[PDB]
Design an enzyme around this catalytic site. Structure first.
Site, PDB file in Angstrom:
ATOM      1  N   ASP A 269       1.916  28.216 -40.688  1.00  0.00           N
ATOM      2  CA  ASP A 269       2.213  28.967 -39.473  1.00  0.00           C
ATOM      3  C   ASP A 269       1.313  28.577 -38.308  1.00  0.00           C
ATOM      4  O   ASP A 269       1.610  28.938 -37.164  1.00  0.00           O
ATOM      5  CB  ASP A 269       2.136  30.474 -39.749  1.00  0.00           C
ATOM      6  CG  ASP A 269       0.756  30.936 -40.191  1.00  0.00           C
ATOM      7  OD1 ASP A 269       0.691  31.910 -40.969  1.00  0.00           O
ATOM      8  OD2 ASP A 269      -0.262  30.360 -39.757  1.00  0.00           O
TER       9      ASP A 269
ATOM     10  N   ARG B  50      11.289  26.555 -43.255  1.00  0.00           N
ATOM     11  CA  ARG B  50      10.011  26.963 -43.830  1.00  0.00           C
ATOM     12  C   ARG B  50      10.177  27.478 -45.252  1.00  0.00           C
ATOM     13  O   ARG B  50       9.263  27.333 -46.071  1.00  0.00           O
ATOM     14  CB  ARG B  50       9.322  28.022 -42.970  1.00  0.00           C
ATOM     15  CG  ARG B  50       7.918  28.343 -43.476  1.00  0.00           C
ATOM     16  CD  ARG B  50       7.168  29.306 -42.582  1.00  0.00           C
ATOM     17  NE  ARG B  50       5.864  29.649 -43.136  1.00  0.00           N
ATOM     18  CZ  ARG B  50       4.989  30.455 -42.552  1.00  0.00           C
ATOM     19  NH1 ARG B  50       5.241  31.016 -41.382  1.00  0.00           N
ATOM     20  NH2 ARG B  50       3.833  30.706 -43.159  1.00  0.00           N
TER      21      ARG B  50
ATOM     22  N   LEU C 121      -4.379  33.346 -42.063  1.00  0.00           N
ATOM     23  CA  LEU C 121      -2.960  33.025 -42.031  1.00  0.00           C
ATOM     24  C   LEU C 121      -2.643  31.921 -43.031  1.00  0.00           C
ATOM     25  O   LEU C 121      -3.530  31.336 -43.659  1.00  0.00           O
ATOM     26  CB  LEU C 121      -2.533  32.594 -40.625  1.00  0.00           C
ATOM     27  CG  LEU C 121      -3.006  33.457 -39.459  1.00  0.00           C
ATOM     28  CD1 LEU C 121      -2.401  32.951 -38.161  1.00  0.00           C
ATOM     29  CD2 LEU C 121      -2.650  34.914 -39.694  1.00  0.00           C
ATOM     30  N   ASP C 122      -1.351  31.645 -43.175  1.00  0.00           N
ATOM     31  CA  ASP C 122      -0.918  30.496 -43.951  1.00  0.00           C
ATOM     32  C   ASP C 122      -1.234  29.208 -43.197  1.00  0.00           C
ATOM     33  O   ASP C 122      -1.411  29.197 -41.976  1.00  0.00           O
ATOM     34  CB  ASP C 122       0.579  30.578 -44.250  1.00  0.00           C
ATOM     35  CG  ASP C 122       0.922  31.698 -45.217  1.00  0.00           C
ATOM     36  OD1 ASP C 122       0.067  32.042 -46.060  1.00  0.00           O
ATOM     37  OD2 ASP C 122       2.048  32.232 -45.134  1.00  0.00           O
ATOM     38  N   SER C 123      -1.318  28.109 -43.946  1.00  0.00           N
ATOM     39  CA  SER C 123      -1.591  26.820 -43.320  1.00  0.00           C
ATOM     40  C   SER C 123      -0.442  26.388 -42.418  1.00  0.00           C
ATOM     41  O   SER C 123      -0.662  25.759 -41.377  1.00  0.00           O
ATOM     42  CB  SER C 123      -1.856  25.762 -44.391  1.00  0.00           C
ATOM     43  OG  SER C 123      -3.115  25.960 -45.008  1.00  0.00           O
TER      44      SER C 123
END
Ligand SMILES: CCCCCCCCCCCCCCCCCC(=O)O[C@@H](COC(=O)CCCCCCCCCCCCCCC)COP(=O)(O)OCC[N+](C)(C)C
Ligand SMILES: CCCCCCCCCCCC(=O)SCCNC(=O)CCNC(=O)[C@H](O)C(C)(C)COP(=O)(O)O
Lengths: 76, 66, 487, 51, 84, 70, 109, 615
Positions: E44, G43, E40-42
């Site tokens: 999220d 985000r 995953l992304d850092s």
């Protein structure tokens, strides 16, 4: 906790619940009733009503100082 | 870690002087509204004459000379 | 027939009996000392009963020749002003004896003997009607108090505090003694009733009044000289502080009431603004300095300076509300303040510390102490239904009638008085416990519960029906209000 | 008690719903009844008997 | 008034991590690493930790909120906490 | 740990000792001089003038001459 | 050491900033139906800046982000009642252990 | 029978606090509830007998303070004004006692809570039934002590202790003002009794010398008394304590701060009306302070998110309304609105506490929603309370607030216009935040957590009977008591309230003004309700302005943080006084300056002098 069961307080402590609180509750009412009798008897004696009530009020059963201070010119 | 000498008394987005200025503006709102109320002069726009009571404005019943 | 002779001789017999008792008999010493103190207290209570409250003349007068030509002699008498002081100074001694009951094995007989000599000396102070002998017993208290401070002190600081207190008392005492000598040489005698009927030249009133003020203001610390009281008070045993605050702080005000407010009616009026100025700033400064103190006994000791400086506003108002209401404050202060030092003494005996930082959360481990401590916190902050409010309010109505400004400044005293009084209670009693510092607790024992009982009863009895005390003084305080006045 | 996704909502007892509905209905009926009696008075359409 | 058992915690935490759009719910073991097992992304990871926070009604102090980088650590943290 | 006496801390004890040994901490700087010459020399004078003037104005209201408060 | 610590520390500061910004955004938008777009945009603020690789320009961006967050932060955040700073915190706390009460403290001889 | 009214709460407290260890958590509740309920029924007979029978009773027990003429005996005065306060205070106290039986069902130290409630009720009864200025002061400061004790009932918390000490400091400034006023009363009339002061309150027309100023004797006394009223009623000068005092239990908020002890100032102003009527200068100050307080609380309460804090500003606004209603020299309407508010504000606090307790002590409106279906009863009760508060037509809040507003309109003076304007805008603001509180807590889509919804339980019987009684009160009592209190020429008050013939504008308040003025509160309430609905239930949520406009963020902070009172007042007074305590008084005046010129700072030169004697 463990140490609060070894601390004596007049109020009773946390979560106090004596085994005979029903009997103690009945006694406390009777004690309050007995000490309230002289207070009621004292109140009915020292109370003054300068004005006669419009309609018969319950306080005329025991209180007797109704329309007594109408001669305020001779008060002490 | 020695304790501080004044270790007996111990709105982060504002400073004391800036917040004092804001308070001064807020209270100046009340002052300006009061000045506007003065400027309105509602006393001269009363729609009825002053009430007049009998027996010389109830002088005797208000404690006046009999 | 109960007279002032027996009341004064009872502590003498009590101190002599213990003087020749072996120290190994520790029980007998304590029993005899306590019995002597209680007998003296009952004697004082009986003397209250037979006290006439319709004559300004001194009652139960007794005379004993001192000089061969009866120039100066032991004249003992009480009036409506000094009767309650005698009762209080005889009532406080048994409490002081009971304080050191457990640890008495180390003090020995020299403790009860010192306290009984103290009681002997303080009873005669409030009963003397001779100006010179009032000074002799005025400054005879130093030796027993010097011994009490030094021998049974807490730390090595006891040498400094005793020296400082002794030096201040001496410098006041001799400057007063010069004035007493000048009065004796001019008038001829030193009898109070004769000195109250002698006209003093206006030039001599200011000098003599200043000289008297020098000695009295030290024992009622006004502003420049309240630096001996905190140190000497903190460096004192638990019972020693009760004597210093309970009675030793009442000499200055009693000295003003007895020898200053009457012998110089003209000088008192001229210096009234001066006393109002000193007392107003003392109330403001001391009640404010109290907030930034960290010692438990150094906070209450600063609660007495504000209260005692509120008294000197009442005395100099020269009316029934002022002078009469100032007496109730000292009786109330003698009970409220001395009870607070018992509460601190309770905390110190168990945990040998006085810093407020170490204390907290005692409401969960010492509930009886918290209930008793809170009650005297309310009394110290002038709550109605307590003896302090009656005296505090009567002084305010006595000074407002004379000067509205001084009554306004003194009214901020109860603003600041209620600040630290509750804020101290919140720190010490309320809050969370700190098991890292202290973890073993013990609530009030039988002695502590019983000791606080007369303070609890005597504080609300004076607070809800002060008419018992007031009606015994109005005949005596009204003759005090006017002396040079004839209209 | 009805569960939609794990979470459940306990259905209130009959006593609470009945009492709430009754009190609200009493309030509404009282408001309308008062509006019938002195509604014109506050509107200024008619004095009680002044004029 | 009884703290839920560990497996009950496991159910809810695994449901929370499963109900994510970027992840693949094919294989979601309790012992997985967000930046090593799911890819995953850092950022999220922070969202998943938050969603766990309101899902159990507990406030993790910000210092070790980012320390939770695996499903194993999250379950242990939400279990050893008594007030949850 | 069978003792009721407090476990005193070095930091708290030293802080209290420093706060109680402040007698020897003056340097006689301008801040102390100004502070003791204002809030200890002027405020008492202001207050004394206040009471004296209050007595004077009370005296003049009744018509009686001022009282020599000296 | 810089390649493992001086750069990775910012990779944790950015996580902290994202957490705090998300909580503040939920605080400002009371209703859950509105929080979704706000969080998506929040985000997107971070997701657009992922193109950077050199520390010479990222650090001032983090400083500016902290400066911005520190002034749009909610004056009255939401705190769980039993969490520190909450309303129910320290209401009826569990009493500390090891505290003992002694009897017959002051008794003669 | 009248001493029993005052002393039953005292006996109940003295039993439940001294012997609570034998009664437990149930017997201690029974004692206090039974004693207060018997006092309440006795107050009901007292109302049937004194207020309706028109025969006041005066009862003196014993002299308390007897100086030459400073006589303040233990006297009780039951007149028409006193009996209304009795039937309000004691009835609300009994309902709060019944509420706390179920509210404090899991708290460990329930008996002490009930003992504190009973002692507070006793002090309030001594306050209202006060014949002198000192017994009134006795109650006036005992009520503050009881509030302080109850605010930090959870002593372990730190915020509770700070709130309690702040409340005590503010009430202490108020008590200083009241004490100065009482001292002024004795200097003029040489008495503190109400009968003598009110009889001789017209003759004195002299001037005093107060603090180097020549002022009017009566005006100065009235202003000093109003200072104390401001201190206790949380007015413009001294009000920050009330919002912070919500850290206590909910029943403490419902009784200690909603119905009673905030109406103490209004009651003292109304009782001292035969004295305030002869100082027209003081009435202007009262009107200005009341208007300012109402508007300021209304503006502050529209952006709060805490459920309990929003209601506190509503109480502050209502007290401001009562204050400048007293300022128009119409005390009957002030007491009428006091009694009206003591119903629909106690109901509001009790319903809010019922919501909070069932929601696992969740107090933030941002984390509740969709509770209408789950909490039918409490939703209905809060609806009734809010509709009464905003002043919905033909309801308890309509018969008093509308009268106050139209009276303020017809007071054709400079002070009256200011009060009318602020009280008109405050109606709109009150409607807005009341409807926002109703919408966010109950009707918006759910924003809470799963755990809070799962553990839900509506109010049981002990927490529902007081609610239902308060709902019936807030429905009918205003209409029932409209005629007797604010009627034309009514003799219900008898000699309790004095309004001079010159400043009597009650008749013109009804038929001297356009019908638009009588409909302004309703129009403003509708506007506020519409604004609240359009900003909460359905909106694009343009809060992005709060994230892009610097002024909007600071403006939001201004209303949220109590107009920057707590921050500014702290830094500029409390911190300054704390520095004034140490850095000067302790650091320089008495630290070493006396020492250096004293006995050892420089006087120790005798060591450098005695040693030289060898020469
Ligand atoms: C003096 C005139 C004004 C009088 C006002 C009285 C108001 C009450 C004053 C005292 C209140 C008590 C506050 C200090 C103690 C703090 C709480 C405490 O510890 O007290 C004990 C003792 O209980 C009491 O509070 C008794 C004191 C109040 C009851 C007696 C009051 C009687 C009526 C008031 C006086 C009557 C005349 C008033 C009018 C002049 C209660 O402990 P618990 O609740 O069980 O919890 C503590 C935890 N643990 C058990 C582990 C220790
Ligand atoms: C209340 C106010 C609300 C918030 C307002 C906005 C506040 C912030 C505004 C400025 C935000 C920015 O643009 S600056 C914050 C981000 N700035 C960047 O330049 C991202 C570059 N990428 C990386 O640092 C790493 O890749 C990493 C992200 C750790 C991923 O870890 P991985 O290596 O595994 O992929």
């Amino acid at each position: 906790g463990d140490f609060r069961a070894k601390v004596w307080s007049m109020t009773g402590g946390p979560n106090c619940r004596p085994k005979h609180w029903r009997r103690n509750t009945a006694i406390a009412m009777f004690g309050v009733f007995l000490v309230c009798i002289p207070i009621a008897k004292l109140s009915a004696k020292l109370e003054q009503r300068p004005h006669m009530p419009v309609r018969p009020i319950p306080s005329q059963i025991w209180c007797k100082n109704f329309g007594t201070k109408d001669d305020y010119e001779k008060e002490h | 870690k020695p304790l501080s000498v004044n270790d007996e008394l111990m709105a982060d987005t504002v400073g004391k002087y800036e917040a004092l200025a804001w308070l001064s503006g807020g209270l100046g709102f009340f002052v300006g509204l009061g000045l506007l109320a003065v400027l309105n002069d509602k006393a001269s726009k009363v729609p009825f004459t002053p009430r007049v009571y009998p027996y010389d404005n109830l002088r005797v019943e208000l404690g006046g000379e009999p | 027939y109960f007279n002032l002779s027996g009341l004064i001789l009872c502590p003498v017999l009590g101190s002599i009996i213990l003087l020749f008792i072996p120290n190994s008999r520790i029980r007998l010493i304590r029993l005899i000392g306590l019995c002597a103190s209680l007998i003296t207290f009952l004697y004082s209570l009986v003397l209250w009963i037979q006290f006439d409250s319709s004559t300004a003349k001194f009652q139960f007068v007794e005379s004993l020749r001192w000089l061969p030509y009866e120039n100066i002699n032991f004249y003992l008498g009480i009036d409506g002003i000094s009767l309650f002081f005698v009762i209080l100074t005889t009532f406080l001694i048994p409490i002081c004896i009971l304080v050191g009951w457990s640890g008495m094995r180390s003090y020995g007989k020299e403790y009860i003997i010192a306290f009984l000599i103290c009681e002997f000396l303080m009873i005669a102070v409030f009963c003397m009607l001779d100006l010179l002998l009032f000074y002799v017993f005025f400054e005879s208290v130093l030796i027993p108090m010097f011994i009490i401070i030094g021998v049974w002190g807490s730390r090595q600081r006891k040498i400094k505090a005793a020296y400082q207190f002794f030096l201040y008392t001496l410098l006041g005492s001799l400057f007063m003694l010069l004035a007493i000598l000048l009065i004796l040489f001019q008038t001829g005698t030193t009898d109070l009733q004769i000195l109250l009927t002698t006209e003093f030249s206006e030039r001599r009133q200011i000098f003599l009044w200043i000289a008297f003020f020098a000695s009295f203001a030290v024992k009622v610390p006004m502003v420049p000289v309240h630096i001996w009281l905190p140190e000497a008070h903190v460096e004192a045993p638990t019972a020693g502080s009760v004597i210093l605050a309970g009675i030793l702080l009442k000499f200055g005000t009693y000295g003003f009431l007895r020898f200053s407010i009457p012998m110089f009616p003209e000088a008192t009026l001229c210096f009234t603004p001066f006393i109002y100025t000193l007392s107003a700033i003392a109330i403001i400064y001391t009640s404010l300095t109290t907030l930034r103190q960290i010692d438990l006994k150094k906070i209450i000791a600063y609660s007495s300076v504000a209260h005692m400086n509120l008294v000197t506003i009442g005395m100099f108002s020269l009316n029934i509300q002022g002078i009469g209401g100032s007496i109730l404050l000292m009786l109330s202060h003698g009970l409220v303040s001395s009870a607070l030092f018992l509460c601190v003494g309770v905390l110190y005996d168990r945990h040998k510390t006085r810093l407020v930082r170490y204390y907290g959360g005692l409401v969960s481990t010492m509930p009886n102490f918290s209930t008793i401590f809170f009650f005297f916190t309310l009394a110290n902050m002038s709550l109605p239904g307590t003896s302090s409010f009656i005296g505090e309010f009567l002084i305010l109505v006595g000074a407002f009638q004379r000067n509205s400004l001084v009554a306004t400044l003194a009214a901020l005293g109860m603003i600041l008085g209620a600040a630290y009084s509750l804020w101290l209670y919140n720190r010490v009693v309320s809050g969370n416990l700190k098991p890292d510092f202290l973890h073993k607790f013990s609530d009030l024992n039988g002695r502590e519960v019983f000791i606080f009982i007369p303070f609890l009863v005597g504080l609300v009895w004076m607070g809800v029906y002060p008419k018992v005390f007031l009606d015994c003084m109005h005949t005596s305080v009204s003759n005090l209000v006017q002396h040079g006045k004839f209209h | 008690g009805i569960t939609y996704k794990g979470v459940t909502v306990h259905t209130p007892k009959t006593w609470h719903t009945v009492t709430g509905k009754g009190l609200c209905a009493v309030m509404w009926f009282w408001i309308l009844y008062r509006a019938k009696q002195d509604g014109p008075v506050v509107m200024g359409w008619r004095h009680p008997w002044d004029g | 008034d009884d703290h839920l058992s560990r497996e009950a915690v496991v159910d809810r935490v695994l449901d929370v991590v499963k109900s994510f759009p970027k992840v693949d719910p094919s294989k979601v073991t309790p012992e997985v690493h967000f930046q090593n097992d799911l890819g995953l992304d850092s950022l999220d990871t922070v969202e998943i930790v938050m969603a766990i926070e309101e899902e159990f009604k507990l406030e993790i102090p910000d210092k070790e909120a980012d320390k939770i980088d695996s499903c194993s650590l999250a379950i242990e943290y939400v279990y050893n906490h008594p007030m949850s | 740990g069978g003792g009721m006496e407090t476990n005193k801390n070095k930091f708290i004890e030293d802080w209290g000792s420093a706060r109680e040994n402040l007698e020897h901490n003056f340097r006689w700087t301008r801040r102390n001089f100004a502070l003791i010459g204002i809030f200890g020399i002027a405020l008492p004078i202001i207050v004394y003038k206040g009471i004296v003037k209050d007595f004077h104005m009370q005296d003049e209201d009744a018509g009686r001459p001022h009282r020599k408060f000296l | 050491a810089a390649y493992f610590a001086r750069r990775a520390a910012q990779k944790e500061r950015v996580r902290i900033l994202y957490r705090r910004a998300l909580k503040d955004t939920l605080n400002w938008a009371v209703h859950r139906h509105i929080f979704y777009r706000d969080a998506s945009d929040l985000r997107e603020k971070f997701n657009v800046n992922q193109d950077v690789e050199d520390v010479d320009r990222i650090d001032k961006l983090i400083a500016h982000g902290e400066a911005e967050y520190n002034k749009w932060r909610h004056p009255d955040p939401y705190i769980v009642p039993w969490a520190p700073g909450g309303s129910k915190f320290c209401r009826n706390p569990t009493p500390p252990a090891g505290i003992e009460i002694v009897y017959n403290y002051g008794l003669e001889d | 029978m009248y001493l029993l009214i005052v002393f039953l709460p005292l006996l109940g407290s003295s039993v439940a606090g001294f012997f609570g260890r034998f009664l437990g958590s149930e017997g201690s509740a029974i004692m206090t509830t039974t004693c207060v309920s018997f006092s309440s029924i006795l107050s009901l007979i007292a109302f049937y007998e004194v207020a309706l029978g028109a025969s006041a009773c005066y009862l003196r027990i014993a002299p308390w303070i007897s100086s030459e003429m400073f006589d303040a005996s233990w006297g009780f005065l039951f007149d028409s004004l006193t009996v209304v306060m009795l039937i309000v205070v004691t009835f609300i106290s009994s309902l709060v006692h019944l509420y706390s039986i179920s509210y404090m069902s899991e708290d460990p130290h329930s008996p002490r809570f009930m003992c504190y409630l009973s002692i507070f009720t006793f002090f309030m009864l001594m306050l209202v039934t006060g014949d002198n200025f000192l017994q009134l002061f006795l109650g006036w400061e005992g009520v503050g002590l009881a509030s302080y004790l109850l605010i930090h009932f959870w002593f372990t918390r730190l915020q509770a202790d700070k709130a309690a000490i702040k409340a005590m400091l503010v009430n202490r400034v108020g008590d200083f003002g009241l004490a100065l006023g009482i001292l002024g009363c004795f200097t003029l009339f040489q008495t503190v009794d109400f009968s003598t002061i009110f009889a001789c309150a017209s003759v004195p027309r002299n001037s005093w010398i107060f603090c180097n100023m020549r002022l009017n004797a009566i005006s100065l006394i009235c202003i000093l008394l109003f200072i104390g009223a401001v201190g206790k009623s949380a007015q413009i000068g001294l009000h920050t304590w009330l919002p912070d005092a919500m850290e206590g239990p909910t029943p403490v908020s419902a009784l200690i701060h909603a119905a009673t002890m905030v109406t103490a100032g209004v009651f003292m102003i109304a009782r001292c009306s035969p004295l305030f009527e002869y100082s027209p200068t003081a009435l202007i100050v009262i009107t200005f302070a009341g208007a300012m307080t109402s508007f300021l609380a209304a503006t502050t309460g529209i952006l709060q998110n805490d459920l309990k804090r929003v209601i506190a500003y509503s109480t502050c606004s209502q007290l401001g309304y009562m204050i400048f209603a007293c300022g128009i020299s119409n005390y009957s309407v002030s007491v009428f609105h006091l009694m009206n508010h003591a119903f629909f504000k106690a109901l509001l606090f009790l319903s809010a506490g019922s919501v909070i307790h069932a929601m696992s002590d969740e107090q933030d409106m941002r984390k509740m929603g969709g509770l209408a279906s789950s909490f039918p009863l409490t939703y209905a009760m809060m609806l009734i309370g809010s509709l009464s508060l905003i002043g919905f037509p033909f309801l308890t809040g309509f018969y008093s607030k509308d009268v106050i507003l139209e009276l303020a309109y017809t007071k054709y003076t400079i002070s009256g216009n200011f009060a009318f304007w602020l009280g008109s805008v405050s109606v709109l603001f009150t409607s807005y935040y009341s409807f926002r509180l109703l919408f966010l807590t109950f009707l918006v889509p759910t924003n809470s957590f799963g755990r809070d919804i799962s553990r839900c339980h509506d109010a049981p019987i002990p927490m529902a009977i007081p609610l239902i009684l308060l709902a019936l009160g807030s429905l009918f009592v205003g209409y029932l008591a409209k005629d007797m209190m604010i009627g034309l020429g009514t003799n219900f008050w008898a000699n309790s309230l004095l309004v001079l013939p010159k400043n009597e504008i009650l008749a013109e308040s009804e038929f001297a003004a356009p019908t638009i003025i009588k409909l302004i509160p309703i129009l403003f309430s509708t506007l506020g309700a519409f604004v609240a609905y359009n900003v909460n239930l359905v909106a694009d949520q343009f809060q992005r302005a709060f994230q892009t406009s610097t002024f909007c963020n600071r403006l939001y902070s201004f209303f949220n943080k109590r107009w920057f009172f707590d921050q500014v007042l702290n830094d500029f007074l409390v911190r300054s006084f704390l520095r004034f305590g140490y850095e000067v008084s302790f650091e320089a005046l008495d630290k070493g300056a006396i020492e250096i010129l004293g006995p050892y700072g420089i006087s120790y030169t005798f060591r450098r002098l005695a040693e030289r004697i060898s020469q």
